[PDB]
Amino acid sequence: MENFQKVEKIGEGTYGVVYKARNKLTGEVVALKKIRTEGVPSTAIREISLLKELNHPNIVKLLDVIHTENKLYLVFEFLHQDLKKFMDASALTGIPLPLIKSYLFQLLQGLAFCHSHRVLHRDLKPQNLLINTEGAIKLADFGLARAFGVPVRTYTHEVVTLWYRAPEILLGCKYYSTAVDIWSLGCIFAEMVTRRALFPGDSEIDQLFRIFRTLGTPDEVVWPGVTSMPDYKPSFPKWARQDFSKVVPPLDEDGRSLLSQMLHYDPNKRISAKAALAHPFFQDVTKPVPHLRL
Ligand SMILES: NC(=O)c1cc([N+](=O)[O-])c(Cl)cc1NCc1cc(F)c(F)c(F)c1
């Protein structure tokens, strides 16, 4: 590394390999993501560079965009653990409700900030939510999707997770809205509560049908325009909706109410991050200290 000192290979994300590195100068520890191929659109580097200006306590800071030797590196502030690992570690006992609430509240603040600045995430999942010992949780990878449209997969044979994809994306809609992030966060909220993924689809159609089996096959009544979506087929089976009391037990009515608003089929009826923050579910929100083993 011309300037860094690779500590370890954290992983291999959807846009390239990730390393924990120490800036031999500043001495700071950061996450270095090497972006995928043989050109790199200058349009992307400009859009990405804009993301450097985004500053919010619940958004992982993009410290630098390095375009040298014709390669693309993203330098991010470092956090020791992601929500996926934390949920696994908390599987036996479950994440306490007060902490689930704190995390959801913080993530909505982060989304409200991004959305008011016209930035969408598009690929929220537990792995993209980072946490620290102080009880904070932050969104990682905001805006990278748009600055790269949709490259389908990661870069080198790796099963793309569809579990958190909004139905409008699954139905072929070409224009994503802020609502896709609320849907993903709703799925994550449910998973923290039940300790099981809400919609663990194994294919795009299995994903769509798992959603339909739980929330009911959508129709023009609940989702005006759904039958005209690019990938909608009149041959879709028609399943009846289940009750939330059965979907995320034993979550209370405040929680079920908020979740139901985050999972409305019509992107336009789906609650905004701003509005969700005012929901009664957050009346008693606090900021608990999580039990992190690093
Ligand atoms: N900003 C970041 O801090 C970070 C970034 C990316 N990434 O995509 O650019 C990834 Cl993957 C993991 C990250 N940390 C969480 C983490 C740190 C570890 F040190 C570790 F071992 C682990 F599993 C998870």
Side-chain angles (χ1 to χ4, degrees):
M1 296 295 91
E2 296 292 0
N3 322 62
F4 290 107
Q5 190 299 297
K6 301 177 179 179
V7 176
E8 307 184 308
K9 179 178 298 181
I10 298 178
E12 297 176 294
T14 64
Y15 271 125
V17 179
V18 187
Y19 281 108
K20 177 175 179 182
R22 177 175 302 86
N23 182 306
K24 294 168 69 294
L25 287 177
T26 61
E28 83 190 309
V29 172
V30 300
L32 185 64
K33 188 180 183 65
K34 309 182 63 297
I35 302 296
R36 178 182 182 174
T37 299
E38 299 177 300
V40 177
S42 61
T43 55
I45 50 189
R46 302 194 186 76
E47 297 185 301
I48 297 297
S49 294
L50 293 176
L51 298 181
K52 294 184 75 294
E53 266 50 79
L54 226 49
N55 152 65
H56 182 92
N58 301 115
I59 299 181
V60 177
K61 210 295 177 56
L62 170 57
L63 307 175
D64 261 305
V65 182
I66 304 169
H67 194 194
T68 53
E69 191 57 63
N70 287 292
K71 299 300 171 59
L72 189 63
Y73 293 106
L74 297 183
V75 188
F76 296 110
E77 78 174 278
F78 180 86
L79 280 90
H80 291 84
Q81 191 161 298
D82 64 54
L83 189 61
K84 182 178 193 312
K85 179 183 186 71
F86 185 63
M87 275 189 299
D88 289 334
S90 308
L92 293 191
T93 177
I95 299 175
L97 184 55
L99 185 54
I100 288 176
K101 195 171 292 194
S102 175
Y103 282 170
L104 184 62
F105 190 67
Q106 290 180 65
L107 297 167
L108 286 167
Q109 296 181 70
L111 277 188
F113 176 82
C114 288
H115 295 169
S116 70
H117 284 267
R118 307 182 183 184
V119 170
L120 283 60
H121 186 116
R122 302 171 62 170
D123 191 42
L124 289 174
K125 49 194 164 183
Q127 288 185 184
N128 289 342
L129 304 179
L130 310 186
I131 58 173
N132 63 21
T133 54
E134 303 277 271
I137 187 162
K138 307 186 186 203
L139 300 147
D141 292 352
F142 256 87
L144 302 185
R146 181 167 170 296
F148 289 115
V150 53
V152 181
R153 297 298 179 61
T154 58
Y155 61 114
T156 53
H157 45 68
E158 298 182 64
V159 189
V160 52
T161 294
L162 308 167
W163 304 355
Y164 310 96
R165 293 267 185 283
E168 60 267 35
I169 298 170
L170 296 174
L171 290 176
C173 188
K174 304 174 172 59
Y175 299 98
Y176 288 28
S177 78
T178 54
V180 305
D181 291 336
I182 291 299
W183 176 278
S184 302
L185 186 53
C187 290
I188 295 167
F189 172 29
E191 188 171 341
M192 292 192 273
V193 170
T194 66
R195 295 124 77 174
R196 194 165 171 170
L198 183 58
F199 303 129
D202 300 310
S203 70
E204 289 199 353
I205 198 62
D206 181 54
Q207 184 64 41
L208 193 70
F209 289 178
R210 278 174 180 274
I211 292 167
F212 292 1
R213 294 187 187 89
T214 293
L215 301 177
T217 298
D219 59 20
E220 290 290 329
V221 172
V222 302
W223 190 352
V226 70
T227 66
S228 298
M229 318 249 63
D231 303 325
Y232 174 84
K233 309 293 178 184
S235 55
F236 286 162
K238 289 172 188 166
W239 286 285
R241 183 180 179 85
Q242 303 295 88
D243 190 286
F244 271 56
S245 66
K246 173 190 178 64
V247 187
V248 290
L251 187 64
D252 64 60
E253 178 67 1
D254 280 321
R256 295 193 306 265
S257 171
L258 172 59
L259 179 65
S260 75
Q261 299 195 99
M262 295 176 81
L263 298 182
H264 276 143
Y265 271 121
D266 188 344
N268 302 98
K269 300 176 186 171
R270 210 170 296 151
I271 193 166
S272 68
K274 180 175 57 171
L277 287 166
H279 192 283
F281 179 68
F282 296 115
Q283 175 279 308
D284 64 354
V285 69
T286 60
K287 193 185 180 182
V289 176
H291 174 45
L292 292 189
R293 201 68 301 167
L294 304 170

